[PDB]
Ligand binder design. Sequence first.
Ligand code: HEM
Ligand code: HEM
Ligand code: HEM
Ligand code: HEM
Ligand SMILES: COCC(=O)O[C@]1(CCN(C)CCCc2nc3ccccc3[nH]2)CCc2cc(F)ccc2[C@@H]1C(C)C
Lengths: 460, 460, 460, 460
Amino acid sequence: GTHSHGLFKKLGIPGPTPLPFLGNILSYHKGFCMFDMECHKKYGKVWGFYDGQQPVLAITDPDMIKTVLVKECYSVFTNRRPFGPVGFMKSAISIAEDEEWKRLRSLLSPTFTSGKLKEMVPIIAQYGDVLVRNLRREAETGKPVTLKDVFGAYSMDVITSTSFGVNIDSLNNPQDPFVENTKKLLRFDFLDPFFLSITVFPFLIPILEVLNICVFPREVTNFLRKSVKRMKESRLRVDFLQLMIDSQNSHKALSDLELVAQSIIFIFAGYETTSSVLSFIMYELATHPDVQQKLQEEIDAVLPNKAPPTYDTVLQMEYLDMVVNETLRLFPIAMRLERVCKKDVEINGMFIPKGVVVMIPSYALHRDPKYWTEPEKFLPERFSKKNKDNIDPYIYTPFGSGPRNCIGMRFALMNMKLALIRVLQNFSFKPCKETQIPLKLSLGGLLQPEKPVVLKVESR
Amino acid sequence: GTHSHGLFKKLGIPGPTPLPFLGNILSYHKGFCMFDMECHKKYGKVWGFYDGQQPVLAITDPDMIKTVLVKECYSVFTNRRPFGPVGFMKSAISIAEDEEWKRLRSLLSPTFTSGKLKEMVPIIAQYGDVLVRNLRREAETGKPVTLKDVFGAYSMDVITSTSFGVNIDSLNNPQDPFVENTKKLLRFDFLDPFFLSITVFPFLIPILEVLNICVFPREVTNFLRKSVKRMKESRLRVDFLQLMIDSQNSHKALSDLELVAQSIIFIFAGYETTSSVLSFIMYELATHPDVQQKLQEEIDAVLPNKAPPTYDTVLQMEYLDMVVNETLRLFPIAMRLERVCKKDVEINGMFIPKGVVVMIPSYALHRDPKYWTEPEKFLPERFSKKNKDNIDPYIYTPFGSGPRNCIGMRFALMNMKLALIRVLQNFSFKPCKETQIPLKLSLGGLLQPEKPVVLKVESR
Amino acid sequence: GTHSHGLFKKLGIPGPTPLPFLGNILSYHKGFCMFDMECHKKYGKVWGFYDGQQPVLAITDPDMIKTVLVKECYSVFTNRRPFGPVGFMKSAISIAEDEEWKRLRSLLSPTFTSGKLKEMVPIIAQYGDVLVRNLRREAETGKPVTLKDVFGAYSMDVITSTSFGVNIDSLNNPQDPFVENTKKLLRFDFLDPFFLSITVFPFLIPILEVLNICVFPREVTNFLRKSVKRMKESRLRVDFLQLMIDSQNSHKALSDLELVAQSIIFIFAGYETTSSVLSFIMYELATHPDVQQKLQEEIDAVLPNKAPPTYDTVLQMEYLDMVVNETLRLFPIAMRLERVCKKDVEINGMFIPKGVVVMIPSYALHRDPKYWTEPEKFLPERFSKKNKDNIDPYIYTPFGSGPRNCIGMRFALMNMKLALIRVLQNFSFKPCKETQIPLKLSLGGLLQPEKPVVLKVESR
Amino acid sequence: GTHSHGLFKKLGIPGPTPLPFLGNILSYHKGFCMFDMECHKKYGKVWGFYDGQQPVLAITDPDMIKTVLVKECYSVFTNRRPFGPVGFMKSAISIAEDEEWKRLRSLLSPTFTSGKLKEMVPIIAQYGDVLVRNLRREAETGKPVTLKDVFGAYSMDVITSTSFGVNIDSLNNPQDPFVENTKKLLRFDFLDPFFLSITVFPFLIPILEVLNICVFPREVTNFLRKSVKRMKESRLRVDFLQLMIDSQNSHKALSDLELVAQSIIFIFAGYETTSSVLSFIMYELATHPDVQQKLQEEIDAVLPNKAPPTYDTVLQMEYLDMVVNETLRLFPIAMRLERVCKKDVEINGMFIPKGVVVMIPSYALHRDPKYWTEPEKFLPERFSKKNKDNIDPYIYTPFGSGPRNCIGMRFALMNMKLALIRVLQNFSFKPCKETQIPLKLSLGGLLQPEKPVVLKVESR
Ligand code: HEM
Ligand code: HEM
Ligand code: HEM
Ligand code: HEM
Ligand SMILES: COCC(=O)O[C@]1(CCN(C)CCCc2nc3ccccc3[nH]2)CCc2cc(F)ccc2[C@@H]1C(C)C
């Protein structure tokens, strides 16, 4: 009931005090993000709490953070915490651990190079054209646009074609076989009934693992499993599947089911994340028409006459970059980074017992007054070539840092940027009566707007 | 490991001998139906086995059967066995038990009278017209027809409109909100991984009931729960919802959530059952064109010039009735009837300990040589007014018998008959090269064809 | 997590508000007794709380209490709550439920008549002689006496010989086979780690029931099971075993294992209960030498010259009775009486939903100022023939009331009285320096002294 | 249900075929030992089976065995399989794993040197004198002697005094506090109900670990935990406790609770093991009076006139050694050695997947005709300095081999030898009518006689 509940009181580490069995989870009634702020303010720089019986040690010192993410990554802090029954998805690089992770990490790093990415741009860019045509039809008829559905559909189209060559217009084909399953691959709400129970009955995982109950649905994983065995057997492009089929012709060649595992996790990592950030950005651009106009101006300069964006001209645009980064400062959608302490260690004047989840509260550091002037404000300027220098890369970590960081970072920024470019080239975006202002974050376990973002969309 | 595994060896009752923990479930590798036959042949008239640790006493004596289903129903054998975590669906009349069942049974019996049914015929009959139009378009283009999809869609249309007034053409609207959830309400395969585990880990039910994992999906039950709260609040027809909303204006008036519970179970009881029998019947009529022609002839006689069937002219047709009943003899899709023994009893020279599932092997009795001449053969004649007399109603029980029998019997026969009438009026049905002949039953826990039934469909 | 946690807020019933999963069990940090008082004071006459998810409705109205214990006992409130995995001890009359309880209750009522008891007095009385000899040897050498060990040994001797004819001097034979197991049969601490977990993981019971883990130890129950099969087979006295072997030569004759079940529960009900009350009484008599002297005087009057007590002269003694009853007022060692509500009901202007544990806080009513003048004080007089009249038998219930009350009441009072008589005849009892004064009740789940009672024991 | 059940059929490895859920455990109805022989004969040199879902790869090639036990011990095969909920005893060197094991292994190796052992001989030897006095009193009165009780008591006396300095005559004090708990520390029967369930519900371990249910009893571990905190605090000899208290004044000094953990495991490893081998040896010496006489002769030669054995004269005796070793050949009481495969590997032309329990069937190799002439026969000669050479130390492994072997080997042989010496010096031992001849091994999970060994004991 109190297993390890004296561990932090003992070691000298402060923090809220736990309740038996539940630990501190009642504190999650306002969300991971709000609880992390309060803990930063009211306890300082290091603190501890209990996800049920599991102690979690929050750390906020950039040198200490670097040690965990960078320095001792491979020796002490290699893995994230178990979070549910995962079945065969224990082979997805995100879930695999220790050496199996390192092998998967290596077998996949060449798939995410800039070269591989530059050759996917003409595919990603095609569904930007699709986006504008579907945006225009809703811009034609004066009717508010709900960003999450139009950007949701764009993200889906980008994934089907980048990882499977499946060329869909997911919006206009809302009944395709390939759209129904991939749309069931949403991000996990670790504050919803099931995942909370898993936290205070971690011993229920093995019970579930033996009933073959799985947090990745049996049908989705089954449909994609067989749908990929078709694609492999009809090919025998430039998409993730093929680069992976390539890398299996100094570690053990990528297995068959391991390739299926990665394709599904790429979807999981890329679907809701992308559409959610594109919507946050559109909210900020719609509530600061000066930033929007400025970006539209920077776009028309590089791309004269709605010229089509390319890998190289995308990377030209400084102010676009500043909008993307400043939006991810406010809304880092992972909320936290975490690693399991797998040994006893001392790092930066602090002993850490084997088994503690060490956690880095990204949302709260990105909104720390002590590192950010006027943190609540959308201020794209803080990332200009002028100011970009005094930003610590261990305070601002929307993609994490170190060897276990987001292997999809460059792909995701290039995907979102292509979207925002082709959309601002043709449209302007305005607040509504119904446009929730100021926007409220959800109280749940996902960093998303309370109410969806809806906006007026006009044509240029 | 062997809890109660001597109970039948002791009492004197024969039967296969169990394995620890698993009981006799390895015997289910050929299906409930085949295992029940072998047990009838090789052990006689009474026998016992173990679904894991749970003893099941099979009985085949018509007097003994009557005692269980009819005589001592309310005192000893009131309930079916628990079969999964059910959540709020513990209020569906099928799952409720003891007095709560009797109340629900009474609060719903007037909803299934013949009067209420005769006023639903013009609704049911409308989607017969819809069936023929969709059948014709597939009969127009010479392309094999897969019965389960065209009869699947008809069954869905009949349910939406009979229980919610929702008027859909489910086939041509394969993307309606109301079709996606109700199509996820299929019959349970108690021989599939999950339900088998539930059988040898019955103690896993409470674990699941507390994670709110449920065998009726949370979304389906949630969508229908709210979708009904709309219909109640827009009404404030002749459909099940309204007759139920009626019966809540000597027992406790039907509750709100109890009404939601029944509407979903009516779907569960009526969707796959109906479409599966309609397909079995079409198989038999397509593999005996003499029966088919004879029925077409009996239909044209009562209904001159594709005249539209009515409640009364439907009940006119003897040979139609004989085809429906003879098909349900071969294919009684419940396979077994069961009741939990809730007390110790002696019935017909046999003591039965509290807790035994008493079970009646319908599939095997319907195909018993000792009651049926040439049981394997489709012989509609055995049910004519001439021969219908020497059929024991405790050997032939496709809808069960007694107070807990199928409260939807008359509705289901009238629904299927309306379908078969309007379809034979306009079409003839022929075997294919691909038409699996002879048809094989599935090895799983549902009584359905191994491979789907597909047939040539011509026009008259 | 909150299953039924709105049930009392809804029905209108007040009470502390629950925490998810745990309900109100954090409130048990001071004990059932103290929590029950606070709830009586601060919420009044009726209230509700949650043992995890299980709602418990406390009631304190004598008419309402009578309804539950007496009036609707057989129809609505027949059983106590499940409390642990019990294995075969589900046949002990205390644990059995509904009709199986009524049968066991009837098959055992004639074993507890006054006639049967009067013939056990010469056995019980013999080990009073044994008590005095062992008390004297500790009274001889001036050394404090720890009541729980000398009365513990007396209680054990009374049980072995009353239920099995086994004639031991448990103290001087602290290594007999028959003493080691029966001494492991102590009362359950429902506030200790295991039983608390059972309360907030009631779903863990079936898991345990299938590993054959049992709250009655496998060895104790096994030793006594075989040790009784010896006694049955060597007999083939006046003791419980024989009266039971008798009653199996209008319900089903007592089974073999059912007889073993009762013998163990008689031990469980009678061992720690008796020794604990004898010690409470000795504390009160030692902290009021006037009561003690008065009782010694009433004993010498009826029993001139340490004359040996008999059934009839035991029942002569009014003041003895008043001391026993007043001690059980302060220390009713069951603390609460409970029944499961098995139907919906209205009783005395109150609706009660099926499934609620209805609970009667005996400890708090016995110490209610509103029924007892100076409740904290040991006042034997309130039970004299003069005052015994205005005591409601539904406020003062140390043995419960109604058909499910203590079937061992008369036996227990006669056993304790014989002890107290033969001991006061020969000894006087005095407070020590170490004698905890005032005595503190344990904070756990058993009503016993914090620290053991130790006292000076002199000879007469 | 069949998780990994194709792993051996796939890899090419033969073996009995499994049943769902249970694997091959029905095969354990004759015991680990008999099942291991049949598997050696009927499948050859390598085979696989399933303890439920857990694959176990048996290996019998001395080079392959050496690789696992010696060569790749620290890299691949460091740990034994989890076997039950162990609580804090996860710190006992036997249960600890990976580096924590290596640290414990090092912190304890100097406690088992020959120097430390030679200084414990005068303690061990003292309770040999105690043994002879208690043996004589049973040899005085002509009454069969049950070896397991007289050698059981000797083993207990040797442990209390070697690990805690507690100087008991456990037999004549069968009621000491320190004897009652340590006698509850018997070897685990992994074929008894509980441990078998753990094998096919390994997921039940975490459920138990959270109810603090433990396979080392809470009371035994609690009594010894506090009883050691006394001994530490009264000291602040030459016994295990002190050598351990010593080693905590290049790894982390032995913790407090870690020291308590080791003391209990030393008891667990040493109590039943020793007494069981001493009894096997006495059986063999009593059923071959020529060996016995020969040993008595070799003892009288080194120790003239019942001279007292010393470390050095104990190691003098070749024929004693040959009797001890030949008895452990027949009866290697661990039965199997095992290690978990923690990586994928190829060793001696064989790939082994991560997670397989690799197992070495000691009992069956010790009785392999292909390495042992007349294996069923007790032939002390095979271990003489003449023949001891062609015995492979990877076929004959009564204490295992390699870094994880029995850290108590020398202590155990010296303890048993001192016993056998002082006993044969004074007694001769003869078969009885009741002496089970030939002796049968138990069908359970412990290598012990079916029926106890009883023998005539005469004096010299
Ligand atoms: C705006 C979009 C995205 C954001 C903000 C984001 C952020 C993150 C973060 C914070 C992590 C954990 C980093 C850490 O623990 O240090 C992560 C991991 C990961 N992400 Fe992204 N991500 C995005 C999109 C994508 C995309 C398109 C992919 C496509 C392949 C992807 C694949 C992954 C993978 C595989 C990991 C786990 C890597 C490993 O365990 O070695 N993510 N992401
Ligand atoms: C061909 C179609 C159908 C067949 C063959 C069939 C057969 C059965 C059988 C064998 C039982 C159990 C009988 C027993 O235990 O004695 C049953 C129960 C039931 N059926 Fe039907 N059924 C069909 C369609 C329907 C329909 C359309 C409804 C619509 C309301 C329905 C509602 C129910 C209910 C509520 C029960 C449980 C009744 C109770 O527990 O009191 N069924 N059915
Ligand atoms: C001072 C000693 C004792 C006290 C204070 C005591 C008190 C109680 C109480 C409060 C109950 C529950 C009553 C209820 O729910 O209304 C009970 C039940 C019971 N007691 Fe006693 N008890 C004592 C000794 C004994 C003895 C010696 C026996 C010997 C047979 C015994 C046998 C039982 C049984 C069998 C029940 C359950 C009866 C049933 O469920 O029908 N008890 N006791
Ligand atoms: C006749 C008596 C004994 C026999 C036959 C015996 C045999 C064994 C065997 C086969 C093993 C496992 C070896 C392996 O996996 O390679 C073992 C382990 C062990 N034994 Fe002994 N043993 C005996 C007595 C003792 C005694 C007196 C001690 C006292 C300390 C002891 C302490 C241990 C320990 C601590 C281990 C685990 C070592 C580790 O995991 O590193 N044993 N024993
Ligand atoms: C839900 O919180 C945001 C989130 O989903 O973060 C990840 C999921 C990480 N998962 C492998 C489980 C690890 C345990 C965990 N419990 C958390 C609760 C709150 C906050 C963070 C938590 N971490 C992080 C890495 C990752 C790796 C992939 F391969 C695919 C998707 C993702 C997402 C991220 C891209 C948005």
